[PDB]
Amino acid sequence: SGPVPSRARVYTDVNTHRPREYWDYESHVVEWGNQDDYQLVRKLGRGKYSEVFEAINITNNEKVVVKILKPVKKKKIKREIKILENLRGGPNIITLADIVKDPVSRTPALVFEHVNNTDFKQLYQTLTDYDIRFYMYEILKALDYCHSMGIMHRDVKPHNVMIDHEHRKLRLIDWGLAEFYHPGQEYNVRVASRYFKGPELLVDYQMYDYSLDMWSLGCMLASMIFRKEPFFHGHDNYDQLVRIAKVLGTEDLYDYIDKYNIELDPRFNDILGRHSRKRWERFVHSENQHLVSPEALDFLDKLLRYDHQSRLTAREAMEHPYFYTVVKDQA
Numbered sequence: 103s104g105p106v107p108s109r110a111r112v113y114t115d116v117n118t119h120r121p122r123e124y125w126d127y128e129s130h131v132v133e134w135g136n137q138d139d140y141q142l143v144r145k146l147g148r149g150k151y152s153e154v155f156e157a158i159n160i161t162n163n164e165k166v167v168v169k170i171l172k173p174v175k176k177k178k179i180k181r182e183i184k185i186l187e188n189l190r191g192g193p194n195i196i197t198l199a200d201i202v203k204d205p206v207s208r209t210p211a212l213v214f215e216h217v218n219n220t221d222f223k224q225l226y227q228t229l230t231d232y233d234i235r236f237y238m239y240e241i242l243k244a245l246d247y248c249h250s251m252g253i254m255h256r257d258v259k260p261h262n263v264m265i266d267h268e269h270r271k272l273r274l275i276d277w278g279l280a281e282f283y284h285p286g287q288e289y290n291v292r293v294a295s296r297y298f299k300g301p302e303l304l305v306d307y308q309m310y311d312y313s314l315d316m317w318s319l320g321c322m323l324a325s326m327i328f329r330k331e332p333f334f335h336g337h338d339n340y341d342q343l344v345r346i347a348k349v350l351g352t353e354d355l356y357d358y359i360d361k362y363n364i365e366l367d368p369r370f371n372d373i374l375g376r377h378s379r380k381r382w383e384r385f386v387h388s389e390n391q392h393l394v395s396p397e398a399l400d401f402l403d404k405l406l407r408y409d410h411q412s413r414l415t416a417r418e419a420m421e422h423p424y425f426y427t428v429v430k431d432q433a
């Protein structure tokens with residue numbers, strides 16, 4: 103027996119109803135700007151797949167962000183470009199301003215709208231209970247949008263969320279791991295940061311959907327209200343599921359494995375053990391209690407579920423009591 107198939111509970115056939123060129127990124131023809139419009143100012147960071155810089159558009163004197171891509175598969179470049187162009191104009195989704203290439207090196211560079219970010223390891227410790235609900239609602243606007251457009255981000259983590267706190271401005275950035283959702287498709291489970299990886303990734307369930315992003319958002323929320331970063335702190339991908347099972351318990355995990363007929367890796371048998379489902383109160387203390395409320399805990403519970411089909415959708419999450427104040431203040 104193989105694993106039981108799964109379909110997204112919402113926006114299942116959005117790409118099926120779209121013309122193939124919408125999602126067939128392999129056949130996308132890139133539109134190139136002029137590299138001489140941009141001059142690099144200073145370096146911002148590095149990664150495995152790129153080096154990013156702050157730049158100046160010399161034609162309008164506007165501040166931009168340049169992501170000079172390291173050598174990767176051209177279809178992976180087309181995927182990011184295609185996804186960025188499809189989500190252009192969407193709420194709290196970074197804007198791809200231009201796509202340029204060096205004429206000598208032949209290296210592609212992605213040009214982004216600039217967000218005057220306040221580093222998450224300095225910002226978060228200053229954030230109030232209202233700040234957390236406000237920004238969580240802003241990421242949810244961006245997730246419901248990309249999900250309604252047939253796209254799963256697959257890398258939701260604090261580093262990929264740009265916040266200009268002065269102007270209460272939020273942008274969900276780095277769409278290099280994003281994919282298009284197609285019913286029946288089996289995806290790569292070696293996506294996302296260890297700490298933000300959903301149970302589906304860790305057990306090797308390949309037929310996942312947008313609900314992957316909801317798990318990641320749940321990990322992010324728990325790190326914020328509890329002031330514990332990272333919240334699930336595994337030493338590897340195997341220990342990452344053990345750290346989760348020590349909070350959610352192994353009963354719901356084995357019931358999840360059962361439901362979908364998941365062949366669990368034998369390495370897991372001896373490390374998972376037997377753990378009870380813990381109450382959220384054991385992460386509450388004098389230094390975080392001002393951020394923890396019964397609403398926050400209820401919302402968090404409804405996101406962090408093994409069974410991807412039982413987690414809240416981004417639209418269901420926006421309707422939760424935790425955001426009543428934010429929703430009211432938005433009128």
Ligand SMILES: CC(=O)Nc1cc(Nc2cc(NC3CC3)n3ncc(C#N)c3n2)ccc1[C@@H]1C[C@H]1CN
Pocket residue numbers: 146147148149150152153154156167168169196214215216217218219220264275276277
């Ligand atoms: C361009 C990308 O997605 N990556 C990436 C981005 C940044 N930093 C910033 C900073 C800012 N504003 C701060 C105040 C200067 N803004 N504003 C908009 C964007 C975008 N898009 C952006 N990115 C750093 C490092 C990387 C490394 C490649 C990743 C490896 N994890």
